[PDB]
Design a binder for this molecule. Structure first.
Ligand SMILES: Cc1cn([C@H]2C[C@H](O)[C@@H](CO)O2)c(=O)[nH]c1=O
Ligand SMILES: [Zn+2]
Ligand SMILES: [Zn+2]
Length: 507
């Protein structure tokens, strides 16, 4: 039996194509219109195609701010997706909007480790796994959601997360008991976690994932540098091959993995490729393009409103903003201090996971600002003891190896951390910027800082900020609006590296 798995992950409301320089020339990459054309051809040509999405459809552009995933859902229906795993961002607005998205979803939404027993709004709207019939054969699809969702999203008090391994292996047994031996895990745990899980589970031949926004495969463009091969192969406890795949992010890539199974559901052969969604891959479907224009109507003005000009590229790539100093991170934090200068703020902290895109040199539109800061978090002014600021910085670099979003970009201070040291004691130096130059952080002194409400409330593992007993006031200042006010003030934006963060003994 031959099955052709066609998949996407972390589309993050990026329905329009983006622009990248490929082989020495600005090229449009991604877009649902182009995906519709490609999928239509795969649907009528490929052998037993099965379309899947690994989660994180939610959060990323004005299309989400305006439709909360419903615009994406319309396209997912047109794209014939058969199953979708719940990602952490599907919980960003709590159970309410998630239920609205699931109510009417004509594809199977799965996650074996999401315990929603305490949430009536999600009853029967998703399942641990699904059984889909393809070419006369049954294929089981087990979903998994990163347990980190508890800290990185807003699932709320009615949703809990279970161990991926225990949940998945149980699902494998249930499927086998039903006579389904061809099983695929649709995971939102991360590439690294998928590789580890693949060495533990038995009965699973393929793991289609996301969460880490990992680019796998090979491309004819020197500008791209994949993190691994497509697919990546590991051995399970029984010495059998397990294929792990991912398709980068924002619909910029579509994965196509053709797997052949025997009667027992064992892997006989496999071939795959990560398809970069450029004009060469396929044209844009006419009607899908028109449909997107329909959705764009209420937010079109914002997408065209230029509020400033970037004289240099403002770097927002996750491998940068979540691991080292970023000039965009410096700009945003500078803006936070600027907006709250009337409050006497001296330091600004911003988690890199909250900076979602780069701003290439050129015009800066309102639409672009919301792609960079999509959450709608507000600025919170609070007094922190030096010890608390230090603890915050430590939490920020505590998961550097996993490129976690808690990493802190800063303004008003500089810090250096040693990666050869254990998590919790990596920050070796912290100095506050003053008129008389840099002064070592005083762990016993109090400093007025500005952060966003998500981390101020304890999100991203910032329990130290949630537990702070000092002065605390939510300004009500929107993050995006505040950043735009700063950009409008500057008019012509320039931002470079200022040695605010020093990475020592980096692997
Ligand atoms: C839900 C939410 C996530 N985030 C960031 C922090 C996490 O590291 C990351 C998880 O995707 O997104 C915010 O900054 N604000 C929010 O409101
Ligand atoms: Zn994501
Ligand atoms: Zn994710």
């Amino acid at each position: 039996f031959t099955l052709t798995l066609v998949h996407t992950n972390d589309t993050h409301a990026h329905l329009e194509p983006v622009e990248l320089t490929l082989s020495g020339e600005k090229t449009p990459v991604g877009g649902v219109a182009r995906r519709v054309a490609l999928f239509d051809r795969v649907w009528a040509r490929a052998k037993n195609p099965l379309f899947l999405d690994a989660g994180d459809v939610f959060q990323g552009t004005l299309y989400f701010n305006q439709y909360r995933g419903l615009a994406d859902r319309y396209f997912m229906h047109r794209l014939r997706y058969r199953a979708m795993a719940l990602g952490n961002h599907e919980f960003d607005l709590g159970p309410g909007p998630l239920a609205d998205f699931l109510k009417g979803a004509r594809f199977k939404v799965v996650s074996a480790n999401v315990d929603a027993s305490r949430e009536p709004r999600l009853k029967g709207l998703f399942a641990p796994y699904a059984v889909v019939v393809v070419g006369g054969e049954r294929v089981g699809i087990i979903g998994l959601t990163t347990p980190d969702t508890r800290e990185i999203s807003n699932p709320g008090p009615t949703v809990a997360f279970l161990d991926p391994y225990e949940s998945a292996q149980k699902a494998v047994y249930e499927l086998l008991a039903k006579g389904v031996n061809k099983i695929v895990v649709l995971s939102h745990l991360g590439y690294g976690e998928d590789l580890k899980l693949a060495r533990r589970l038995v009965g699973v031949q393929v793991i289609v994932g996301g969460h880490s926004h990992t680019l796998l495969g090979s491309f004819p463009h020197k500008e791209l540098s994949p993190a691994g091969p497509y697919p990546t192969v590991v051995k399970n406890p029984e010495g059998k091959d397990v294929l792990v795949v991912q398709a980068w992010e924002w619909g910029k890539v579509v994965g196509l993995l053709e797997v052949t199974f025997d009667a027992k559901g064992e892997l006989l052969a496999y071939k795959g490729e990560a398809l970069l969604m450029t004009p060469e891959a396929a044209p844009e479907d006419f009607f899908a393009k028109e449909a997107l224009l329909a959705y764009a109507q209420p937010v079109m003005a914002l997408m065209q409103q230029v509020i400033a000009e970037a004289k240099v590229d403002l770097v927002g790539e996750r491998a940068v903003v979540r691991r080292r100093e970023s000039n965009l991170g410096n700009l945003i934090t500078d803006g936070m201090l600027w907006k709250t200068r009337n409050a006497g703020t001296q330091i600004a902290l911003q988690n890199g996971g909250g900076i979602r895109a780069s701003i290439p040199k050129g015009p800066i539109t309102v639409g672009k600002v919301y792609e960079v800061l999509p959450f709608g978090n507000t600025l919170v002014v609070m007094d922190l003891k030096g010890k608390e600021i230090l603890a915050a910085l430590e939490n920020g670099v505590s998961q550097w190896e996993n490129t976690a979003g808690r990493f802190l970009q800063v303004s008003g201070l500089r810090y250096a951390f040693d990666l050869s040291r254990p998590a919790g004691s990596r920050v070796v130096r912290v100095e506050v910027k003053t008129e008389k130059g840099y002064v070592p952080l005083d762990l016993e002194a109090t400093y007025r800082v500005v952060v966003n409400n998500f981390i101020a409330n304890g999100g991203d593992g910032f329990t130290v900020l949630k537990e702070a007993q000092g002065y605390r006031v939510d300004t009500g200042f929107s993050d995006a609006e505040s950043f735009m006010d700063y950009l409008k003030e500057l008019k012509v934006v320039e931002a470079g590296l200022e040695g605010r963060i020093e990475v020592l003994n980096e692997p």
